[PDB]
Amino acid sequence: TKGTIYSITPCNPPDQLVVYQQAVVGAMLSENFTSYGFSNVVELPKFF
Amino acid sequence: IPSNWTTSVQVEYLQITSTPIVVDCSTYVCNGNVRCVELLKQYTSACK
Ligand SMILES: *[C@@H]1O[C@H](CO)[C@@H](O[C@@H]2O[C@H](CO)[C@@H](O)[C@H](O)[C@H]2NC(C)=O)[C@H](O)[C@H]1NC(C)=O
Ligand SMILES: *[C@@H]1O[C@H](CO)[C@@H](O)[C@H](O)[C@H]1NC(C)=O
């Protein structure tokens, strides 16, 4: 119709998580959001 | 016997490290189809 264009991002990109002493702790993500019950999402270079 | 010398410089190069790569089995092959994931579910013995 007009000329606008749209990208198609995938729904669920893989997330990197960490475990220690047989429990999960911390998580490397892509979105500035607290997906799990973690109380803080420290923005860091190249990742959250 | 040798008398007073002159200086020179020689250059060498050594490989020291390789950029590591990591892969997600289920993303790579399934590509997000739940039924594909379920057919794969019986092969977790393999791709682990
Ligand atoms: C992570 O932090 C959250 C809150 O910051 C902890 O949550 C409490 O967990 C219990 C057990 O499920 C719930 O009954 C409470 O309602 C939760 N509180 C809130 C505010 O959601 C959680 O236990 C922490 N977990 C770890 C592993 O640190
Ligand atoms: C990330 O989330 C925090 C949470 O308060 C917010 O203050 C900040 O503006 C957000 N940044 C981006 C780039 O979304």
Ligand SMILES: *[C@@H]1O[C@H](CO)[C@@H](O)[C@H](O)[C@H]1NC(C)=O
């Ligand atoms: C070596 O020594 C002699 C005498 O001191 C001098 O004439 C000559 O230039 C020197 N050579 C070098 C390469 O320094």
